[model samples]
Target: AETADLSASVPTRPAEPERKTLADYGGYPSALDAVKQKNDAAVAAYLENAGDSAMAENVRNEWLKSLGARRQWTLFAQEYAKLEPAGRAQEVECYADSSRNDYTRAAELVKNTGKLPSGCTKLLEQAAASGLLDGNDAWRRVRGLLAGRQTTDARNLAAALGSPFDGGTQGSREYALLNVIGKEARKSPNAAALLSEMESGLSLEQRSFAWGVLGHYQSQNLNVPAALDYYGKVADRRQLTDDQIEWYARAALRARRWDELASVISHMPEKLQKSPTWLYWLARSRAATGNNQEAEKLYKQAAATGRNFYAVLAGEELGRKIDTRNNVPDAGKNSVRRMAEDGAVKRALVLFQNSQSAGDAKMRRQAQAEWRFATRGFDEDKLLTAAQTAFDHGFYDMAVNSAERTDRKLNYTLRYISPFKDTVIRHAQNVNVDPAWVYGLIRQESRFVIGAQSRVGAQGLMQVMPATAREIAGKIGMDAAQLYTADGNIRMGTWYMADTKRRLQNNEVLATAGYNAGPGRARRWQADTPLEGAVYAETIPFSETRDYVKKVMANAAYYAALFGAPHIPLKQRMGIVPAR
Candidate 1:
């Protein structure tokens, strides 16, 4: 009896908590299994108690795609109805339209500018076959696809239309030439020569578009001499795409052909014509030919735009003073401290710290995600405070990103936060270059993100490419490792800037281009005669280097004003570029 009583009175080992498994409620294994097996019954059972997460949403999307692919119209509609409009993908609506035989609606949905998904392409074919779009209209879209270098898309469109200009295996000879022009032409230097030799059967429209395409690619490669020559052979300028037209004007501008530049601007799309960059260029073109009465009118409009490089250049032309007033807004008291206490911000800071350690493959992306998450639903004041906190924490990239989110109450100081100021200033002075310009270049280079690296492996604050770094380090009598420090990056960066300036005859515009592209390429872009600094900048054949020079020059102006220096005119800073 005592032995039996011990079983009831003695303490027992605690039973382990119920083990969690995928078969448990709200688990992913059942849904995943259902999707794998394509079992309707299993999926329905899993969805009965399903909750929302990325895994659940992705699974749901896959299920919807599967239903559409299987042509289950009734079931597709039922499942698609559960998706929120904000969460709905563009492909889903096209499938739903297809289910109802609403080809007209599907056509509207398929009217996109760029690449379409498989489902949307199918919908586009259905609509094209249903007589919703006219021949002229359909073929016109085909031309646009060709202009955009969407060879596959143009092939699909022409195939659906059963037009002579088909693509792929069934394409005509003319279409083959068109394909080469749009797609394969960029791979070889002999592309233009081949087009000229083999284009005996092309229509005027086709031939002109081909020439435009060649010029467009050449301009992008900074080969403006060939681009200008090719553009001059266009049979009908109307057939050229907007990009082609823009680059044509840029090539003419580089050659200082004022008449052609003005004509191109006059015929540009209204939206493009009104942009400050082209508008100012248009005014300058007219002024170059002594058409200043109208140039003044164009200058006034361009001057009214924001403080961009073009706008400032236009303002200078109109004799207006630079608006260098300091107008930074204040982040509220204790706001940064309050923001630091938020859970998301705290996690972001932890992840950011973790990213600096070795062997942390995913930490950088996770840190970015957490940073973006922390700023969700924040108002203007909160955004400024977040920016300030990021600045205080040495997250320089996030500081600029957060500050740029505010719609109004713009904070120039926060927008242009300069960390390691002493290092930058000391290095810039050593090379006899403007520190403001160095800061400007660095702002664009990495937004002050120390240890930043480009896809091309350019590293640190100034994005010093490794090959160039080795050469510069050797010239400075230091090891590559010795020049890899935060201080050393500025030192090398400023020296390089000065070296580029010297190579380009002391013109900052040419030197800036030389720094971005190669010194040799910058020298090739100079006009045969003396050119205005702004004109030389606008006409840079490489679009990327063209935009880069503009932003850097504008940034330098702002940095100068912020540094208590006199507002030096952009014209003076850039100066004149004489013939090469």
Candidate 2:
């Protein structure tokens, strides 16, 4: 967040996304060693006699990390393909790709924004030395590091590349430019304006990247058209980071520049362009540009079988309903129980039972890792059973995780599980808010895990911070302890939802934004003109809040149908936001 931006980096939430163990480290014997140990000998002996048991497989997997850390790529790749791999640590994956000289795959896995791990540092170094990902590619990584606030990482990359941006006795204009540009784009103004002052000293790649950096922050501020203008200044699209590529397309989408949207989406990473978000937008762009055939194909592929937001939008674009049809019936309790008592599922449940409820996020993370380790090879039925078993054990978040992996055999019951139904309903009705909306918010807030807590201190299924909950709890005549119980959290969450709805003019869209960001911000995000609901959401300044609002609203749509409400179109449900 900057002075120009209304939102800060939204605090990390347990509910926002799951974790991946980057490095197993020294804790697990010598199997997961750093560079110092040179644990290949220990791992070689350990693997030779290893059994088929989970622990044995675990140790074998750890050796993969050890191998990766040691830059033993050939051994790492071979070992990686053999085991039921856990963690899918990208660091190790990048190392394997580099070992095979699979530059394309290596580049795809690099993730152009946020922080890259230790393995990536080596991978990038090699990519540059190999003359494949240097100049534009390596410099793009520096911009990505800047995007993620990885100042040290940026400095490291710049220093390695022998760029002037790494601070030294000579005051570097590029370094100052990066720090200022990331914080606020408008003050730095146009890249064109800066070029006059600093262009001579900047590398050829850095000049185009400066334009991309400007576009990224402008997009962050929801200045869609201006962002597009900045993005247009770039000669090479590859100079843009992953964040910039996505935002470039988003700017085109919000501004309704259909041809430009198609072009921008074309520039996206393969996986992202394949994603429903871009697929739908790309489809829309195609249709807009008179490629109805291409658009239809894109829409069909993008149209979600589940109630995903973009897919819902995609379905609407294709004049179809959100698909809910599934061949598989619900798994029986007996069947689920049988599966629960066996294999990786059993190992996961034992961990889940021990780690149930709030406090010690680390322990819950362990359960998550175990659950993740267990389920990579499961089929649709097994995934469903795993979800149900996890749900029964109150590992609701993990259940949602497992349920989402299934492509066929879609079960809304598992995907949108409504535990404590009557309690949630009663509280919502009492507060005069829609229960479906409440369930929708809860589903996203903490995935209905009883002791759900975010990194920022919001707790319970509803994720109300204790400070705010204190006021709400006091008003409702409840103690701090009760505020964390499933029902008690519901009471407070429902009350807060109702109060926010009232304050924000009864728009669920605005209130949903309010819940994740702030109440005032929900209103502040409104456009100067009356904005369509989907457009408002797509253009929100905060990425996490933007995503949260979209998912919550999408979840609410399913929740409404599941809760026996009449069919309401998702767009209509999101409704319109008045001019600010």
Candidate 3:
């Protein structure tokens, strides 16, 4: 009887807790949904327990920005600080300041920031209407807009200043000069003639401004010699923006003006010279001018970083093998478990899981927000833990982002998680493509998000455009639905990459470029001379494609190291890209 009573008292083994969804926690699945549905109550409930996760704060900040944009200053002020640092809260604060008759603070905000929030446009309009913005403030804003290439905005501001050009006042003179500069800057087939026309009618300051504008146009148009000529005429160096200076440097480099390039580098702000791009160029310029010792010293300075495209180039110049030291310490199981226990991590996991259901776009944004917020205060170890946490939850994008954030302690494991490994490897093998290259492409394309989409209608893990996917599908006897599936995307992507390589003469550099900017652009960008891969990459015309090629190469190198593939030097991997 005692034994039976003991057995009855004993309970069945405890059942596992059921998985929780956004709904389970009384949270909206997406920040957009929360904002659109006005589900502030639900957001507040989640934030009560969500603590300081990036997603929670991101949603809050989004709402706050919207409120400020809507001119709900009362509520906007209440939630201003709740928004994350990256939000438009600062601009909103400036608006608030202007509203309270604190024009000085508002003016300071406008003057100091590079890019103001869209809300600031309305604020500026209001200030102009209320006559709160002084003459100097108004003029400064006009100059700022013009310098930022906001020509239409500058014109609008001038219009709001009561047709400044029509009055024949001092303001009219300023407006006339600005209008002439803006109009000619857009299209100056003969910049020297335009400069002469402006010089006769304009003040020294106005002429300098016109010259700078023309210089920018020439630089953007890739007329290196013309740009240099225009830039040289801008006698007031202070009038030229940092970007203008950098463009001048780029023009000098492209023209092979070694002495001029060295001079530009030497005259640049110390901070600019210290950057990898300018540092590499400065060293190269020095080398070309027979300053070998100084060149080597600067090359070492640039190579010491070893993290960017130019840094890799610097390393190659110094004959340093690209180091692949594992900086991320191995995270033990217990360490991962401990990290998973954090509220922020748990919230991110829930958000990520919610994204797997329908309405994935919304959930993805929410998850990303949460993950970003949680990582704000993370040290290297915390970043490692976050990466592991993200990986464990099958959030490869977040895993990569978190790992990449740790500058001093990079974890290749997390940075290159290789999601859908089986499918990728299988397809890569079938197509006779390098798995490392495929992985690198995937990293740049979609960051391994299964359902990622681009603004241009690219879809899935490899970011295959819908049209491209459909075309590939037709050739391979696949249905359109298959394009969304992991295996199908991998199959099509691998085949496309392999075909690209074949068409590009088995040169991975050209193949990568073709993959990004299309085969047409890649072929067009081919050098007249068989150029070093780095030179070809740098001269690729489109900045986005240039960076994409560099990243793909760097990522491939790291992936090769992890796979224990043949130790190829970075330059060799870049190889020599051939002329058309």
Candidate 4:
């Protein structure tokens, strides 16, 4: 009876735990399906409840590791921007190596809800995988738009790749240019005979590739209409944001399709309706089409920032009277641009030095613009009294007119385009000369505006005299006419500079002085006394020569820091003799 009771007392097994699936985890098979089921709320909730250690930490840590593969901190930051908010702070702070914890310490700024860090959006860029950008056909299309390619055909190709016309990756920039030309070849008279003759060359894949290339070429060149066909496709896409539309609007403006651009602007994204860049471009477009009042209002809106310097400048151009406000001062803004352009840099310098209450935003822009053009920051304002300081310095109309004749667009990357750029970069790279130091000299010599000339019959962009340029040009096998062109002048000038470096025994200061005053002067200065480069430069009999060397070196240092290039040690760049 006891044995029977023991057998009956054995309990049944417990029920198994249920398996967790995508549904259980708050994800649906499709985004549309999930939305219909209101599953996004569940996912958001799940993520909201997700802890740093459990969810955020893993994603953040992985993201940080991925950034290590990149060569540049800027590139790292750009990639970090693509991450969602839960991981943003971790990645940005991690990249900063903020052991002081200041970045995370300032977490309050990113708090209150899961959102991206401030300034991250401004810094993030969409870049290619190889981290280099070239305007290729595939790139011209959809990916190009994402990369901010502003051409119409490029945007349409990009848009076509997006949805209704899903372009295969096989039809890409790396391969498509060849195909475009190949298709043109097939349409010629002997093409069929040539195909029969070279059967081995006419493989099925090769012929197909040729046709594909031809297709893109025909699309770009002959197969399509000028406005309504290729470029019009980008104009038609509505999914783009106001910012995206603005880029197209700019393209339209460039193409002189003002009416079409006006229609496009009307359909801009709702949120960016008031963005400064948008307003500025809109006003510019409006002004181009002679809608002065509307343009002025848009310009005002565009310039309506912490302080409206852009608007005031625009107002000046329109011949409108400007009212001076004591608290809201345009004094510094007015003085800097006005004085710099008028050759009264001294007056501008005084305004800057005395303006104790000036804000940073205005100051930085002025500095950038000035440094791009100024030979010197200050030439002593002790001669001018306080009343003169308050007064408008001089007329800027002529200076503005001259500046307008030249491309005022200041890009450090422009150096990359000038043929001189490669030589400059190469020399700087190889010899430890700061690239900015080289650029600064060029800036002082030519303002990067090629065709600049000097009082002493110096010619071409770098102001190289005909004799000196001819010698340098001969070494590179270029004649006078070729040397006279921007690229050619830049090349000869840089090559001559490289020659100067060799003559100076690789000393930057002597080489720079040689560039300005000629090697003869440099040798004479050396022979007169074994003076160091900086002392030699300062003690030069010519006041202009002394000032030129000092200002050029300073400009080099400033530009280096601005353009993310390495700064040369000032002592070395100035040829200051190191203390023994």
Candidate with maximal lDDT: 1
Of candidates 3 and 2, the better by lDDT: 2
After superposition, the stretches of candidate 2 with alpha carbons farther than 4 Å from their true spots are 1-67, 71-82, 85-88, 96-114, 132-139, 142-192, 197-205, 224-228, 285-295, 304-306, 323-326, 332-334, 357-361, 474-481
Candidate order, lDDT descending: 1, 2, 3, 4
Is candidate 1 or 4 superior in TM-score? 1
Clashing pairs in 1: none
- What candidate 3 gets wrong by more than 4 Å, as runs, is 1-56, 59-115, 118-144, 147-174, 177-185, 188-192, 203-205, 236-238, 265-271, 304-306, 421-426, 429-432, 470-482, 527-531
| Candidate number of the best TM-score | 2
Q: All candidates' lDDT scores?
A: 0.73, 0.72, 0.71, 0.43
Candidate 1: segments with Cα more than 4 A from true spot: 1-127, 130-141, 144-150, 164-174, 179-204, 217-238, 286-307, 321-328, 340-350, 357-362, 369-379, 527-530
lDDT of 2 by residue, 1-580 (tens): 4221111111111211111121221133455452237656766665654323344466665566667777776787677877654545566667776666667654554456567777777676566556666455666676667756787777766666665464542225456666435655434655457554776776666666777877877787777677887888777776777777778877777777899889888877788789877887788789989999999999888885455998887787777765454446666777666766554555555545655544555556666766776676677777877787788877888888988887756777888889889899998999899888998999998887777777778888888888878888777788977786778888999999988888887888889999888888998788677777887887788889999998999898888877778778887887888787
**Count of backbone clashes for each model?**
0, 0, 5, 8
Q: 22 in model 3: Cα distance from truth in Å? A: 2.6
Mark the 10 consecutive residues where model 1 has the least summed lDDT. 4-13
Candidate 3 lDDT for residue 501: 88
What's the TM-score of each model vs. the native?
0.76, 0.80, 0.78, 0.29
Please tell me which model should have the higher lDDT, number 3 or number 4.
3
Cα lDDT tens digits for candidate 4, 1-580: 2311101111121211112211221222232243345453443444344321112233333434444323345645554554544444443554444322233332232111112232221111121222222323223233323223223333333333332223544334413333223334534545434534443554343333333332223222222222223234342344333323444454454344667666667666544556554565567668878898998888666544322323433443355433322221122343433333332333223333332244333432332232222322222221111112222332121122222221222222221222356656764565445567667677667655444566687876667888887787677667867667766666676677778867876766667778888877665545322444544554344456655776676556545655565434444455542221
